[PDB]
Design a protein around this ligand. Structure first.
Ligand code: IAY
Ligand code: MG
Ligand code: ZN
Length: 313
């Protein structure tokens, strides 16, 4: 009951900043997540015995892939922790409970391949889920783990609170499908600008939580340049692997996934910052002003890619 998690001083301070990197010590990641739940939600939100069992089963169902791994799950949950802590009073008790879990679970049993690769390969999951294929799978794996004996961290929610929380987690996980991001942000843009944005409107909250999910999922672009750059190598290691598998099925992959076209990575990151990242954190900053540091860090990293291209690194 009175058993707090405490971190060393540097982590205890830096974990509160948007740009915190959880470090290379894997055995500290579970404790970092519990720390964030206890301050985001309270020491009462979950039974520690059950949360600890849930965390370790979720860890087990992330694979040893270069990018879409247990480290990303925890990184994405920390960005959400930063947003919730900088926006205390905008979020219900159930929302704070659901979103940290949604973030930890959002990429469960990822194999390092896109929805396109599953469809061109004709993977069973592409027949079971025609759109947001991996994301429907990740939500499904979440429900599985929640139903293992001793793993129901929501046991003490009422029947109806329970259904609300699994509904928050479902929409939050589905929204991590970047194919859905573009129109979600366009609608959030029109609503903010025409002044129709209304946080008491459930379908509006849903959109805003969805943009938060894209923001946390993409938060590698909001770290210190050396974290941003080194993470870019991990994400390209998956893409180039998928490119290799595209060629094995007899399909020229897009340049993004073609390891022969590595030269063009700096320009490809530029397009991505301009077309996805900057717009994402811009609309998030307009809706939730305290998330401006994510926009500011993203702009700094855009400038760092501009320098790579100009031969200054
Ligand atoms: C859109 N595009 C095009 C190219 C490219 C590269 C080389 C040759 C030709 C084209 N490359 C990107 C970018 C990919 C990409 C996609 C999703 C996330 C992400 N980041 C980087 C690391 O941390 C989190 C988000 N980057
Ligand atoms: Mg994903
Ligand atoms: Zn992800």
């Amino acid at each position: 009951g009175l058993m707090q998690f405490t971190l060393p001083v540097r982590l205890c301070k830096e974990i509160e900043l948007f740009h915190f990197d959880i470090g290379p010590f894997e055995n500290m990641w579970p404790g970092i997540f519990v720390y964030m739940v206890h301050r985001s939600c309270g020491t009462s939100c979950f039974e520690l015995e059950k949360l600890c069992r849930f965390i370790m089963s979720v860890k087990k169902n992330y694979r040893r892939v270069p990018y879409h791994n247990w480290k990303h799950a925890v990184t994405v949950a920390h960005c959400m922790y930063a947003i919730l802590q900088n926006n205390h009073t905008l979020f219900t008790d159930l929302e704070r409970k659901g979103l940290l879990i949604a973030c930890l679970c959002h990429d469960l049993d990822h194999r390092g391949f896109s929805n396109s690769y599953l469809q061109k390969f004709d993977h069973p999951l592409a027949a079971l889920y025609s759109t947001s294929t991996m994301e429907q799978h990740h939500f499904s794996q979440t429900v599985s783990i929640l139903q293992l004996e001793g793993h129901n961290i929501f046991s003490t929610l009422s029947s109806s609170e329970y259904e609300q929380v699994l509904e928050i987690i479902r929409k939050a996980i589905i929204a991590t499908d970047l194919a859905l991001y573009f129109g979600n942000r366009k609608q959030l843009e029109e609503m903010y600008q025409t002044g129709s944005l209304n946080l008491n409107n459930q379908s509006h909250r849903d959109r805003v939580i969805g943009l938060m999910m894209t923001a946390c999922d993409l938060c590698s672009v909001t770290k210190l340049w050396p974290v941003t750059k080194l993470t870019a190598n991990d994400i390209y290691a998956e893409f180039w692997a998928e490119g290799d598998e595209m060629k094995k099925l007899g399909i020229q992959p897009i340049p993004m996934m073609d390891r022969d076209k590595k030269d063009e990575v700096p320009q490809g990151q530029l397009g991505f910052y301009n077309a996805v990242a900057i717009p994402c954190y811009t609309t998030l900053t307009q809706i939730l002003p305290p998330t401006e540091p994510l926009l500011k860090a993203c702009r700094d990293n855009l400038s760092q890619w501009e320098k790579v291209i100009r031969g200054e690194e």
